[PDB]
Symmetry: D2
Subunit: 292 residues, 4 copies
């Protein structure tokens, strides 16, 4: 279930920055039709930072309702306060999600023992499988493999989205966890390499605009057909790069609009509409992938 191409889904908004149900329906039908394994709802790519807990809950429950059992949903439940993370966790108990994606606390920079106490306390308040999420570029906190090893001993801590692009982390973590602990890439440009080294999938920004290609690449990689997977990776590499020409998710929301998947690429401040330079880059990348 937590293998293959998992999309970190955009939260589509109207002109006013309010969630657009018509666009969210189009996105979810697209993922159902194009082999996406699961949807991560309100991760970083889904603008977790600018949605209230109430709006956050509403987006996850709308995603579940529109999925209609056709595709599993994972709830973004990260917070930099343990109390707040437990609150989000309890909100999604018996919601219908299959698990939670929970980021390392950002801004306050806990110690590794702080990370252990944070995720242990969260895991205690749910039966839902927990996927840890390390992205030190954004958080200022790097959860080291030793800490991942310690947390992997807790029953419902089942995996990690490793977003560093540091490919030595795959076997550094595998050495300290059981064989069924799930390793997922959170870095699109190194996802293929990550899976070649033994990772079992990607939680992907690229999947938003290249669902079929990402699903195919992950299937081929998991089957050990690395040459065939890499030919797809090379078609997608301009997207893997240029979807971060401006901070995620500014480029990918314009990408979704360019493909007619969303009505508008509106984001909530402080995130801003894509620049002309950014738009030109994403256009070229989409064309290279044969999608425009």
């Amino acid at each position: 279930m937590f293998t293959g191409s998992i999309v970190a889904l955009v939260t589509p908004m109207d002109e006013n920055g309010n969630v657009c149900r018509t666009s969210l329906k189009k996105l979810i039908d697209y993922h159902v039709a194009n082999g996406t394994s699961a949807i991560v709802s309100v991760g970083t790519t889904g603008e977790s930072a600018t949605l209230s807990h109430e709006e956050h809950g509403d987006v996850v429950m709308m995603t579940l309702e529109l999925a209609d059992g056709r595709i599993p949903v994972i709830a973004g439940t990260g917070a930099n306060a343990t109390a707040e993370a437990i609150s989000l966790t309890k909100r999604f108990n018996d919601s219908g999600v299959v698990g939670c994606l929970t980021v390392t606390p950002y801004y306050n920079r806990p110690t590794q023992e702080g990370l252990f106490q944070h995720f242990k306390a969260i895991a205690e308040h749910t039966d839902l499988p927990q996927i840890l999420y390390n992205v030190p570029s954004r958080t200022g906190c790097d959860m080291l493999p030793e800490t991942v090893g310690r947390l992997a001993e807790i029953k419902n801590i089942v995996g990690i989205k490793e977003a560093t692009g540091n490919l030595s982390r795959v076997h550094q973590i595998k050495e300290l966890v059981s064989d069924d602990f799930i390793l997922l890439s959170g870095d699109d440009a190194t996802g293929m390499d990550f899976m070649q080294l033994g990772g079992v999938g990607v939680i992907s920004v690229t999947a938003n605009v290249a669902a079929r290609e990402m699903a195919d690449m992950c299937r081929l990689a998991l089957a050990g057909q690395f040459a065939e997977a890499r030919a797809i990776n090379q078609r997608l590499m301009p997207l893997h790069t240029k979807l971060f020409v401006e901070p995620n998710p500014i480029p990918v929301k314009w990408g979704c609009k360019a493909l007619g998947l969303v009505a508008t690429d509106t984001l909530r401040l402080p995130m801003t509409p894509i620049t002309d330079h950014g738009r030109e880059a994403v256009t070229a990348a989409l064309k290279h992938a044969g999608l425009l």
Copy 2:
């Protein structure tokens, strides 16, 4: 008013993580007695991350009440959502605070134009002076001198707490702003250097445990007595270093406890109590400064 030694005040807590009014009274009395210019209430050092908006308001209001006009109070009002920053800003308008300290959005990594629109929107919803706060190690976002320069043209944006320790930024910023724009260090180990280059004070962690020494150093630096100011700096340099032996504010909360200023050095998860290694380092630094 925004000059000299400004303390980034700890939020003292009991064993259960509730704010300790008895300890907060002792802290405020200590700053009034020892020459501190102003108090920043609920900044990074004040555990802004793990307080609710409601608890955040209560700590600022309790700080104003106990200060009783004896020392000015600046509200921490930072948020990574523009709507949330505006709501925090409105909560403190007409409260009695003299200004706001507002950090660059963390985790979501806006563009420089995003930072411009963020702080512009905040400045438009207040009468209060706004001090920008740049700490990319924690936020993943570096507000560049060019952007500070653009924001300095907005009426209510009056200065910046520059915490990078990049001392080139003093004159890179001064070159782009009026002589009236306030430059304050947010990096204790380079605060003396920052003032010698033309900065007009420090928003200080070290001031929590060495208020008199920091007030004297800033006074002598502003008076051009660099030799005398630097002799105090050398007495404090072990504190400037070792108060970050673990992530701020883990060490400084233990330091306040060791000096009898707070009853407990309890923090809120995910922040954790100081390690034995940390305790020994802070003990040695306090003794070096002649404070234990």
Copy 3:
């Protein structure tokens, strides 16, 4: 020929810093007996910096003589002046070496076009296969995959020792070169990962003290036995780490002494004898690998 475990051989010295022929004989006999694919003579690990061109020539020629056709020898020929690199290259033409290992110019930081002209000029003054060597931590110069791709089109430039530990570079380079172009790890702690991604061996420091284990790991990796190769990698990981506890080759020269392979671990200034802290770390790593 340029596959498997290739040792970056130490230049053994007596107490006066003169090359020890008795120790060099023991080292070469050890590599022949323990499956090493080839010897790099006077690379970084061989103290290229502190040997004269004349002493450099003598060490390579003595290595060829003692090898006596039993194991191929690659000459270190790197220099930060193109004229000097050509002169070194000419010194080893018709010597009996099978190829040259030529580092990116250090200290003077040429452009990518400068690197192109440097290695093009060297390649034009030789019949010998050339292995590029990229180690920006030491040189201040990072040869990018694009530049490797341009150089790979020159007849005598046959591969690269990529020492960054950036595992993304395996397929970034492979994408721009023929299947014949040789990719070798120059980073011992990521060498196993590098081979699993499609690298065909390692130019190794660890091979100096664990020749049999490194030969077995590279053989199993090239055969696709990743699980068995990784079990050897885990036995060696303390060596892969602790052989850089002080700058290479300070630790590995002590390691060779501890195993009886050299009489003294003397280096030439400015390189210094291992510290007690370093000696203890290398002792513990050798014992972990079952070699003491």
Copy 4:
């Protein structure tokens, strides 16, 4: 003598990469006429890496002959082998130079104790004042303030060219050395800040094309006229930046040609002629400074 604007002089070359005496005469007459305090001959800016010891000696002795006692000369004597550094040091004993500029060993990355033994051994073989030179971006080795402190106890180790642009090093070093130890900037963009913090001059790339302005800025800074010095610094800041648009000394040699100070901007491989983009940047910077 080792105060004010010291030029790190370019080594002017004809089309063949041979030293041009006519151009070297023009350069030295220019520095004599425009207030330059001293000439550093065959530093990094003088292409130390691509000149043989013989050619190196010839450039320093030609610089002395053309100076004709009108301006002091400091010899570049750095090498990454202690033996080689002693050889260069002995070459300039009783040459007529007033001192030596000696860089931290590059590429081989000695320990701090290695740096101490290197510079101690060099200082023993001369009566000439030695100026240490820290530029870790180029060398891969960072000489820390504690090491500078230890070396400052040796009689003829008299100062340091600190090229990091880390302005906290000024008082970190001053705290550990006597008041007469000489601190010079090796980073043009932070030279003014460095002198404001107590540095006594610059060993400058910018001085090659803006000798009069750099001499004036250093005189005003040393006299405590910081506002007047900074107005000159702002006129020069495009040069301080764009003279590193490509690695030094590629831009500054074109700059010297553009001002008619040298016949050609030829460099020795692997250094390359300035790109069109580079030329446009240096042109704009020279115009901003009012020099074209």
